[model samples]
Target chain A: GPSTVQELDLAGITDSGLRADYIASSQLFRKIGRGRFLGRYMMHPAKRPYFDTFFSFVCYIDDLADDINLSVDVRARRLDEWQRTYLAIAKGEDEHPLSLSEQTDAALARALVHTLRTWDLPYLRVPEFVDGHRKALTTYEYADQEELDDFLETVTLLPAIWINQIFEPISEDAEELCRHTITAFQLLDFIWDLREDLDLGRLYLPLDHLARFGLTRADLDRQIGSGYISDALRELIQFEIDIAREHMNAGRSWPQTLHPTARIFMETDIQTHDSMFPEMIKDDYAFFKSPLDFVSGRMTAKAIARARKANQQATRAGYRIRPPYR
Target chain B: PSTVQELDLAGITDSGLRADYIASSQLFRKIGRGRFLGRYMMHPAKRPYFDTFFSFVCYIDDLADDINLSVDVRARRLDEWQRTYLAIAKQTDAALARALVHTLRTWDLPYLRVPEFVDGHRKALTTYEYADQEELDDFLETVTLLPAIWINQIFEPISEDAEELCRHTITAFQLLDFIWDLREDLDLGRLYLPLDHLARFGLTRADLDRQIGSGYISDALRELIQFEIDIAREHMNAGRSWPQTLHPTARIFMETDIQTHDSMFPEMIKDDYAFFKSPLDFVSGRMIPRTAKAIARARKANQQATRAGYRIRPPYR
Candidate 1:
């Protein structure tokens, strides 16, 4: 019998809608959660279920509003209804008719109610997580790194922070470290998917940042690695790497405050990604492929290595240490 | 409601409960000397709540621990108070419980933990009658641990880690009081010395009574005394993480508590826990002579008299 979170199994989701939703949602979560490094290393069976179910929930809430098929009012109202329903469930509220035909939303609500009770999480943070998503439904852009960081916290890292608190006595470091590392991770995604985001017409690299380097949209979409373009993009990528490292380093003392299991996971995670910054600077800054990948439409071995290494390191976070992601 | 503590109790309509509140409030503050440290560490808004809630708890404890009554009588006295507390939760209750009920409901804190507070005091003495290391741990959670959680949670959400830290600290806190009150408790026909801890040194109930009057600690008693002192020392050390785990204002509050016990614990274990003389006269275990000079001179005279096998010191807290 495979394990299920709140009776909703990722491997055994009951129907096609739920199955497809869970797969797509979990596929996205794989970008963030390495799966069970936290559960295996830090948590007990008591807390492990909550951690597992929360991934299901992350999938559910995201699929609720952000799904491309969602109309604006429907997406907006579904999240509001979700928050109100959970608020009533503060300790003991209601149950859905899920014994019959129900899928993602029903599974998520039940899983959350189980977790909120089992973990003794901050009750308001749940509504706030929904509230953040409610706010996230509107499209907006960041003017600078600070603005983007704060915005990212509300929509992206806040739910992650709350989920990590499935056990009591979660420290200040737990909250702040989640913020820093997740922020760094988001930055990494933007750096890696720069051309795709540009192709799809999203400018994640703040305009002011490009202005500082005296680069423009015209320069990114265009031609060769001549001199200025290479210098500007190289410095821009390096600038983000420095910012990422700086944020992670600010709470370098985090592991000391964490439990041994939690500490070991954090240490290995920080070190693995922290290992990649210098590597990204290698060989005529092949990291970005001189926007040549933008031209050629191919990924370099290094970019492939970064993605593969990241996934391999996360799932078996404690199985193998550094010097080898294996 | 008085921010400057020890204020007039005019607003408290019932005078008898008012007097109890004043006396207990004064003693509770004196226990930590919190006035000096509290202003520095306690959040200004929370100080008044901390003061009132703690004093109310002390007053309830006094009703149960009062020597003037039999154990059965004291238990009933406690039951009466809790009845009013539970009653207050439903709506309102007038009298001594009013201040406490107000303190609780104003913060929208649980009226539920109040009944547990009643259970803790009732359990404290019975737990003393029968205990071992594990039983001792249970008793600490009951008598010491839960009360701290109940009080601290009223002000802030306490962490699970903070709960464990409070145990280590408060166990030391309870055990310190245990040793201090040992001779006096024996006179009052109560013994906090757990049987297994005494058995570790081959001591017994008969021997403790004999030593109380006869005025010399036997080899077994000395061994047991050393055992207890070491346990208290170990727990005191274990509480080191508590200050770091506490909220900023509460951190200073707990630091002062740790310091208060630290200063007293060394002398408390002195001469193998000879806290009260000639075993102790419960009537005379606690007292103050006319002056500081008298206090010093009288203690010397009493120690000399007790070694010659006679009752000495006055009844004391």
Candidate 2:
């Protein structure tokens, strides 16, 4: 009944080797998160096990690509093998017998396949994640917004799309809404993390977009060196934020389609993200100097108040809250 | 030829990765003249690997000390480093990472020590008080000795005796850095000197503040400084016996670094610890004289080894 083992048991991860793998993966999860706001998703007893298994694989593959200490060739090869084994198993083509060298990866593949089967979910987007990793290695700057959109689609948006499937049955309108929400999140994320990404010699900002302001990556570097955002860069950031706000505006009403509990949480998250836009603009977008210091507590509090009120209205109207999970 | 071109000879082919290695060494040269001097003493073929390792050390040290970043940012960077370091077994597109992964694998060196390295920086973020020598050594073992031990292991077979000497040499090197940077560390509100030692010298943190504020060192503070200096001197003496334990070709490189730290004692004493003054300006103070001498010695030794029909081996190749 130790805490870690209890959680693993509660999550229905029974095999000893797979439990060990999950435990290690969870340690990585802590290190990466520090470094999480993801504990909220563990609320449902029926869904918690699948969440654990899927999220463990998420952390595992994330580390696979983001671990900057390994050679690109080695990371590519490791990811290739993982993707191949996962696809083969997901398609029922291979049992993926364990070997001493690949024992950890094999266990994870088996666990992920098991999670997918439990929900009858097809992992058609696995290659997208793998391609994102490959693109991270080979690409530094996106050529245009369309190219950047493709990268964002695979790297961030698809993961949320997959996680969304776990929470509810898929619908075309729901999928479109999810993409709108995630696109908004991704754009803001790129803006907030622009400094850090640039520090790592990657520029997530599309070159064409920058050219629209007559700015270049070199101009961004100059701003970083000076610790002052230039007028052009500020204009560029405003441009991106405007696009992000539009998406968030469209996605604002999408969370209403979910069960009451899901609706409240999702609406709170969407509204919280909405709050950051005004605050970020008021701070004058000095992201290169340091990460912004938004009043996130107030943001969350205000968002929760609004979400709860909305949740109450829906319930009073006799809008039946469906089963939370499929 | 440029540094990157030289790195090319060392098998770091990726231009981006080579630039990263070069940048790390430049940072290393700024902060660590002694270890940077090891490049001259090392065989040309092996210089890039040592550069890569020292760059690795510089990356961790920079993460721990960068004043521009916040505590949260530093912790975040260390976490990222730990994650990336653990992935060395699995696979980075980052230049330093790729180069370091290549270096670690080429030498078949231990990679697990990196997490411990990251942990040391993590501790530095919040843990400021050192209660005694035992506590200090616990910290120094990772922050100080691991680099020395790993680099030594690269040049010679690992043995208990050699590790003991690694402890001596690196601790000596570390204590000297702490002593010299005492004023700077005080400004940062960090005191690496043992609290027990401060008590023994009848000194307190208040006394350190007064000395920094007044630009004066009380006799008690001087004694406290000397007490720490004596510890480094003793370690330096013990480590002076270490180079002979290494391979013949590696001995010169180790000896040069040993000599570099040993040479600092005189200048530090001459400048009277200069706690309030700027750090012993290595570039003007003794960098030229001693570095010239070391280069001469290394050149002579390399010629002698070649004359004796030695084929001039790199540590790995």
Candidate 3:
């Protein structure tokens, strides 16, 4: 029998249990939410199934890579076998364990089978990701900005964009919006993870930027509260904020194509971003200094309220204007 | 409460129906049969999620950027969308309509998320140029690969050691693919092999296309192969303890697959006399054969373990 929802709930409470479950569930929801949002606007019904499978699979893989308890070798071997299995499935070869459970993970496998049959998706992309993961495992330092950009794109932006395509309306503007949005997300993540990444011996802060500020990885590690680090962080954050703003503006029309519920969801996201700005400034962009330094719950609620109000205002304006399209 | 069989039937049949209700039941039956045969080879529940995620991503790759698709048609389609959605949102379009509704309904799966993937595809369409091998690899690494791997990490806990092994295996696969698609990628104006390495070898893209045998190209090929083999071995060794850690059948399956790929390296290297030429041919022949062998080995390993008084039920059985 497939594990019951109760069993799943029970699993969530055992041994690092709640945290693990929360992270896992959150990760799933985030990916699904993002994927669904994009798919609604970008893909046709015929195309939606393919994207559904692709995005779900991608989210699943991302989670796999982040699990730190498994040995690298075990992860590698498992990934290899899985890739081979998937390729075989794609090729219409029914091998065991591969053919197992139509019941438990039906959505996962069904989406995959449907996409493979309809889209003839290649197996090579698996290797591409595998290679990237390998590089990430061994190399933490970026020699230059180009290298940094490569990692950012491969690890974050590209997947985000790919996921976006599932929902983006077929148009240049939508395409542009997707590109900007993904880049914005990447930048946001980079900014958020700056301190934690430094702890991991990874400094994604561009070498050029570091040079401009006369900062080095060592200096970052020392937690030097010099003006240089702060100024550099400020400059980087500002640059990213500007880029995010542009992307948000570009994506403003994206929700218009979506169902009203999806539109509201997107509006929330934009509001979330808007709220993060003052907080980012308040922290001086040092992400890991204090646990409570990030956005507070009170602030979050306020931001959500503001965003909802803004959305209502826009709706009222639309009503008054009697927009022809709607 | 939904019975397992009922849920399975509903989900599988629903998916099949989406494909026009043609041959879905049969497909599910086949999958069931296959599962029965390979039950001993299934990975621990969490491991294959990565592969599952990647399979879907590959689907998007095919639809948006497959070389097999006619360039003119693809371009025309892109242009049409550019014009249509540039200003006004249209609900009548089947592509957008279907994608939206499907996504809205099945909003739980992460891989079904559409916006980022589309954005990546659009970017790919615009920026086709690779200034160097590193840049090309970087592009492929991020844009094409990492998302699914990241997704997999979310489903199960992976130790640092396992993560490292996964990384090496992935690197080996990438290098192998680059070596295999050297000619095809070159024709497409893409060079995935490191330009720095080629420059070191004093080989140009033209030299590669000509398939001209030079000491430099040979040396480079050998070096690349050696590097790849070393990495593959490292990954395999690192993961050797995995079977013990995982379900017995999954262990057997994984070990078999890795070993099969490892065994093919010598034959692949022998065929092309260059790392670059052997991958495509190997994929069609040696790779497939080795994979089949691995699957067979998995079944045998499971049966033997069971005979030895080990209680091993197939994952889905």
Candidate 4:
């Protein structure tokens, strides 16, 4: 498979500083991140760089929200500046906010602009992500599932919608399915990163839901330092896990309607999420001890296997198969 | 005050680079508003920086408009210049490149914009005329408004609303430039006036060239000029409040600049859109009197701002 930089090269990103910016952005995904792996799942060379760059830009802004060293005021200012700068580049406006201290930011912003123009996507989507991060700077916990869902609609689902649009260039029919798919993905992310999220003083699990299990925010914090998982916390996580699986089931039917490449892409992500459930179950639904580490190669192979099987069926149905990046 | 050296261009001790900046200032001095804006209106310390930027822009603009060079040669030179700008830190030969790189770093301006700026000139090498207003607007965005915004931002931050006003302001300025320099642009075998706007008045490129030496504008050409002048006026009005949104120095400079340009519409109307007549009066005549009026107009605005509870309020809060 082609490397991310090689994809950038194929995409005709020739400027040295621009390429450096893209590389720096991609490096932000060195730890386990969707774009790093899902980028490899993408089949078209043209779409890969955009997928990589867009997600990298997403990750960059996300870091801004999470930067512990910076004051809330500083991070908020940078976040607002980022959205305005990206919008200016996207809209071809002359006056734009500058990323004076961070050239990587400015470079990735231009790449996102290029990607948005390529698809004729809405320029407004850029700010949805920006505004999401801006809200995240202060919003540490949700009062209820509804509130959390509302936040993810802009924070998580908007980018999911953008990623889906780039993946398949589908019509509005897929938006509902995209929401379900990302809903599943984000829930799973919340489950897997529960400890890290708590470390950052954020709890993705809604308070009402935690209260339903006779748990509270204090219990979550107390459990983290004690290295002890409560029975109630385990029950709450399994409940959320099942809720995530229901979303995965609802979204499964939608990916098959996409282009074969996009179908494979969606199927792979869905199957990957599905495989994580069993691994978590084997660990007795551990909420803190890194359940993702228990996911073996064979479990991941199952996800890729199902995706490849879908591609083969697509080809047998006379769908012309384009070569994946190599 | 003295020369390029007297400006706050610290560490720019290279003598050749200083000479290049002075040469760049010469180009800046050639434009009618350039001297008035750069010499009298600009903050003294900022004069060299503005000169370097304007000269660099003028240099790139000439690369595309140099009728003496074939389009192929111009394209090749622009490509080389693009490479030079990309690797500008290591560049040692071109003094213009060195000067601009210094300005860019000192101000922390967007480096990516230079590539976009170069692309605009490259587009100009092939695009001699615009088919419609939309295409012309896009062209102006790249070639004109981008640089203007950069210069404006050097003085103050631009809010989203502020940029909208700036857009209208720069559009008015460029459209007026196309109207006033109609014959000169045609002389270089380029026509910036959108063809659709010309068609609206039953005009054409030939119509402009044919009427150039008639010593009077044809009725159709006169109507066309009027149409353009009115559109420029509409944009001028849309952004008339833009001066109040700038830093004090920028505010005064922009107010004076607007006053100076806005004054010309009446002059052009008084002259019956007779661009075929010598533009010497249009370009240079009555500068002393006109500048007095513009500065007085700016002072009135400033005095009102002062009365509104600010001793020169901060820009665009």
Task: Tell me how many residue pairs clash in candidate 1.
Answer: 8
**TM-score ranking, best first:** 2, 4, 1, 3
Candidate 2 stretches with Cα past 4 Å from truth are: A1-28, A31-42, A88-101, A169-172, A261-279, A289-326, B1-317
Ranking by DockQ: 2, 3, 4, 1
Cα lDDT, model 1, residue A324: 7
- Candidate 3 residue runs with Cα over 4 Å from true position: A1-52, A71-73, A98-110, A116-126, A168-170, A224-233, A236-253, A256-265, A283-288, A293-326, B1-317
Q: Model 3, residue B41: displacement in angstroms?
A: 47
Docking class of 4: incorrect
lDDT of 3 by residue, B43-73 (tens): 3222122222333344334345533234444
- For all candidates in order, the CA lDDT equals 0.53, 0.64, 0.44, 0.64
Clashing pairs in 2: A70-B91, A70-B92
True contacts kept of each: 0.00, 0.00, 0.00, 0.00
Model 3: per-residue Cα lDDT over A1-326, one tens digit each: 01122222322322332222222332232333332323222222223233445666666555445433234564455456555655665556735542211111223433444433333344345556655665666667777778876776666665555445444344555555656656665666666556546645677667666666666777666653222355564565576567667766666676565433234445555555566556656645433333221112111234335544644554556422111110
Ranking by lDDT: 4, 2, 1, 3
> What tens-digit string does per-residue lDDT give for candidate 4 at B13-43?
5656665555455445432223344244444
TM-score of 1: 0.38
Which digits, one per residue and each the tens of the lDDT, describe model 2 over residues A1-326?
01344345555666765555544344334333321324333223334445556666776677666544345776787788778877776676865444322544655666676666656666656777887877777678899878887788778777777767765633456767887888898788777657556766889888998999999898886675244787888888899899998988777666655444355456666765777677567656544443332213221334446544654564577643222211
Question: How large is the interface RMSD of candidate 3?
Answer: 24.0
Top TM-score prediction, candidate number: 2
The DockQ of predicted model 2 stands at 0.02
